[PDB]
Ligand binder design. Sequence first.
Ligand SMILES: [K+]
Ligand SMILES: [K+]
Ligand SMILES: [Mg+2]
Ligand SMILES: [Mg+2]
Ligand SMILES: [Mg+2]
Ligand SMILES: [Mg+2]
Ligand SMILES: [Mg+2]
Ligand SMILES: [Mg+2]
Ligand SMILES: [Mg+2]
Ligand SMILES: [Mg+2]
Ligand SMILES: [Mg+2]
Ligand SMILES: [Mg+2]
Ligand SMILES: [Mg+2]
Ligand SMILES: [Mg+2]
Lengths: 204, 113, 101, 51, 467, 244
Amino acid sequence: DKKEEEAEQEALSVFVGDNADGEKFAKKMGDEIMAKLAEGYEDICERALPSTAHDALVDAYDTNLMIECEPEYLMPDFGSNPDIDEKPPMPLRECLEKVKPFIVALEGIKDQEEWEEAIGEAMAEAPRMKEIVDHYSGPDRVTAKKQNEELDRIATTVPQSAPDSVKRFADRVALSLKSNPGWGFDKKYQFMDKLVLEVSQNYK
Amino acid sequence: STSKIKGTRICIAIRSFDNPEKEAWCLPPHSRYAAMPDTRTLYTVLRSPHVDKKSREQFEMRFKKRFLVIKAQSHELSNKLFWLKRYRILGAQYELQFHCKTRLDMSPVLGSK
Amino acid sequence: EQGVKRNSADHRRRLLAARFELRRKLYKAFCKDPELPSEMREKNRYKLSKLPRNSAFTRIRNRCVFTGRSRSVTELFRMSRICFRGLANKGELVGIKKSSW
Amino acid sequence: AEWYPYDIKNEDPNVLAREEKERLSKLEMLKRRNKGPPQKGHGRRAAKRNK
Amino acid sequence: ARKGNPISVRLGKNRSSDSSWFSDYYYGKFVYQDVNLRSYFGSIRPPTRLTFGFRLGRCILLHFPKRTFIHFFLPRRPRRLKRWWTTFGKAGPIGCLRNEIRGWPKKKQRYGYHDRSPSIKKNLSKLLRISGAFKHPKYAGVVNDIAFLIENDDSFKKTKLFKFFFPKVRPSLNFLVMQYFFNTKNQMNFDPVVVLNHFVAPGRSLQKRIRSRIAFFVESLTSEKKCLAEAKNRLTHFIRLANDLRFAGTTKTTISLFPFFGATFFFLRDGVGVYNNLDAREQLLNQLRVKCWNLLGKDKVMELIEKFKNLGGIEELIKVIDMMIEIILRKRGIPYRYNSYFYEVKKMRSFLSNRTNTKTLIESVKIKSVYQSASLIAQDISFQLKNKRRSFHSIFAKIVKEIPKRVEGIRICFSGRLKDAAEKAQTKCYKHRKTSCNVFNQKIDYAPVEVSTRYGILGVKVWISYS
Amino acid sequence: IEALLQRRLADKHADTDDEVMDSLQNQPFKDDVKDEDFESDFEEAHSTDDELEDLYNSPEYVKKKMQNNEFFNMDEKKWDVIVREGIRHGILKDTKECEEILEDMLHWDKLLPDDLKKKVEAKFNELGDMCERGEIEAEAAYELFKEFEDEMVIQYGDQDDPPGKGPILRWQSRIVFAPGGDAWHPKNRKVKLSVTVKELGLSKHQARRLRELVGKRYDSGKDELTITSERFEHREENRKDCLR
RNA sequence: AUGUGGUUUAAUUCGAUGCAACGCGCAGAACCUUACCAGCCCUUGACAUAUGAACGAGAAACCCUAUCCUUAACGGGAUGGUACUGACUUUCAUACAGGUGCUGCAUGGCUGUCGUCAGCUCGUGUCGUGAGAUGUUUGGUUAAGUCCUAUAACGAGCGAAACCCUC
Ligand SMILES: [K+]
Ligand SMILES: [K+]
Ligand SMILES: [Mg+2]
Ligand SMILES: [Mg+2]
Ligand SMILES: [Mg+2]
Ligand SMILES: [Mg+2]
Ligand SMILES: [Mg+2]
Ligand SMILES: [Mg+2]
Ligand SMILES: [Mg+2]
Ligand SMILES: [Mg+2]
Ligand SMILES: [Mg+2]
Ligand SMILES: [Mg+2]
Ligand SMILES: [Mg+2]
Ligand SMILES: [Mg+2]
């Protein structure tokens, strides 16, 4: 068993070089910025050197986010009614303030400074979660009220010099496209745009 | 009683190629159990890659379905949905049906009575 | 692009038809309203006739994906009868078992 | 347009390397006995017509 | 009307398929994926002269919503028995360098494989390392008493919590931001109060109760703005803050409530694998430190002392050692003692997961002999005939001699140009003990294989019966 | 490290070092594994099985291995048991104060008595009257008076169908849990809502005009008006369409 | 109505030929399919891999919700706009790619038939110079070497029956 231990020793010593410089550094400045550099090395070691447990917990997090953040599984509160009027959403900074005493009583938070530090770390971590939900959920939804408003608007973008039959045709084509769930919205407005362009080619 | 559960509830429809009763442990707990008729689809193929018209082999595809009823009140539906999103049933595809009741607001239409 | 030499022309036809699906539906939509002006109907009929004929959905033939056979192709499995029987005897394609009665 | 799917063997680069090695090896076993393809533009009918 | 495949008659009863799923809208994708994956896996690492090779016997595929599970079965290597620190060439030849309303929707697919997609694991790792690092002293106390409980109390072991948690940014605001973004991106009205039922487990302070009710009433009835005289009142309206800070106390316990990270640990439970390299991690932890500590300082201390004398911005040397540790890990190439088999398996799971948009898993099993499936036996016979060393009678004799017990009979057929001098192809069939295929409660397995030869294609068929 | 330290000091090629980091972190290398190294680690990573004896019943073996996992399928009863035991062992915190404050956030206008509501409202009116003048040191003394009279008010104080009222709707909605990582199913976007006509209290002529406007969405044996929407691409959109 | 032979034609694509080919391959020929014929075209090609040159630090090909002109049509020529390229794009060269061309009398795999007829063999033992025989030669019963009895034979294996599905 001499061969493998001599091989690992000759590889290890030639990896480690000469041990004058580490002790010279130990003598040069002191131990406190070495403690700082050791904490820096510690935060490197959870990025640079791979860990199987780190990758497995990343995979379990990926699975949880994949099931949770799916747009096809969404079901809202079961004791509420739809918001027909489509009120704009209140902002996130105001949303975090009307939830305050529950999570203060729950999570800890001994005083206002601890509270503001928690708010700081949440607000600074927030922008990359937008990229996370961009990867998982998709681009956006765009409500059907705005979709029908856009489809009605491009129907009103006809030139005036056309006959009224063409205008009735455009409004009727928009009306029959309004209630089609088998078409993409991009294809719908592409269809309306091409119809308007084809009429405007001859009704300048 | 044995009367039908009508109200706030969950209904699970499970479709499979095999019998779900073979592995009963992966099913969610439920109040009622029932089964649907099996459905078969018939294929008749020629045996030979050339002219042997009177020699056929007949295959089929069989579909099986099961129906589960879960009684649940209004507060715990959002609690049960989190776990119902993450189940693993063996060789099956399941269907979550939600029965819940809300109330009507009459204020913007009461002027017309 | 997909590997089978005999499916190459039909794959090209499928891509070319999926490209021109939008214009075909548009000119077919213009030609079907009789209250519309006659010159506009004539122009849209001309533009529909000028489209590439290989972009028409009636030229697309179902072929087997493993082999390329042009006849007896089940649309659910996308395989011909010989490939279907060979894979079903072993016990590969799920669901399909022998049948007796 | 999705009728012809994608073959998952195309992403692993080992198997295409072995397949191309087999194609090259067959071509060389044909070339070592002078039964390979002729020069393009120098076919047998072209050489007979030039003869 | 001829003899058929044995598997087709006893497929339903006495046997089970290698896959388990169901679909109706997505049948054509899965029926192609099964055939394509099983055709791919059998052509990986063929045996050379000096390698036993990858011999896949049965591949088991289970499909679940967004989670797919694969089980491989391989025989053990038959063999009679008796560095990383300096490597080169495993690295880079070049260090590189010399619609607002009119949006687009999510593209769908139904029949095949998805397109090639960039990953998100870098962002997930970056989130997890600098968020929720559990190095806080508020989290330091709980692991101390859980260590006390595990080493001394048996009622902690006989408890369902141990059996789940150990099978042998604070997290609340993170979920709140998750829920807010997920509701506003899909444009559903987000009430944060009903989200608080997630942080709820249904299974003296009435003065505080009435004070909280009136402190919520004073924030409900107000907020009629555009008045500075009552904005002074808003400035002295910090009894909402009294309601905020009324319920405060010193906490000794962390949170294992709110089932959203409980599900993450539930997923961590069932996909750990069997391999970990913490020993090889901790062996490099204390040796790369003394490597990087003595590397710099080689009669080049002038730049370091210039950096010291400039200002207190020494923390860019952390970025310097980041660059150097990336350089030293990239030069050698591949992790230190990470198994190449698990490297190839992980590399396999990565492209499967990316191409299908699931989280696939691969679990391997090692079995005792090659005589446990007809597919394995036929692959062995084909590889033995690929280089001509033995005769067919010798191969059948060897198989009969070293067959394991519990096999109740065997039969092998060879077809093609068996004799080199003759050109007319014939068939040779060898049999042993019982191979009655016409009994439906027997356990008969069958497999073919084809061999390329000098003179065409040879064919091998194997029937094997089990007890 | 000398060269990059010097260029850290120079700070002129700072646009290059970040791309050095990107290239060293992202660009692939020659990750080849020879087959002897592929096989030599496999047998030291896995041990030989002892109970198979054949690969005929491989799926049943795998299914039994998954059946033995007690935490294969998990539900809220299981999470409730494992959250009760962690509270009992002292590692977990009771959430009684959290549900007490959540009940306060949800329902305060139902439990607060109106005779207290009107007197605290009059107190807010008089304190907002005295805050505008600013002669009462309204930044802190007004809050102190608020606390004093709030303590006085608290001393005076300390001595199946849905909630609310109105016609009741009934909803139906579907979620298809397909396997394989593709989630969209055509049955996703259908929403139904059912209502009783007689609960709206319409007149007879209004009911006749409703029946004429409806047609066969009205069922006479149950007095059931049922509206179904599939014309929109998302489930909530179809729900809103049903209500409109 | 449909298939085949024959005949005719620019082509009337080919295979299948007593039982065991001929409403067969073809579970869908107007164009496509199509393998046949006439014209109009192309030549590292509609597609792949490798090598060697040329161009390009963002140009060119590429693509589009594209537009116009000209072709019987594929294509070809212009005009717009977006985006990308250095271990990476294109252009050219040569190894080639490609073949429903021949051989089913070189093959694998798959199938029809004798035939759901009850048959075809092997290990030890005995008889015969030997090829071989007995076992499987008696008397009956059975759909059946299925079962009994008898027998220089004693036992096996593939087949029969039962196990399987359905009423
Ligand atoms: K004998
Ligand atoms: K019989
Ligand atoms: Mg071919
Ligand atoms: Mg067709
Ligand atoms: Mg002929
Ligand atoms: Mg014949
Ligand atoms: Mg043609
Ligand atoms: Mg034709
Ligand atoms: Mg040809
Ligand atoms: Mg023959
Ligand atoms: Mg012939
Ligand atoms: Mg006989
Ligand atoms: Mg005899
Ligand atoms: Mg017998």
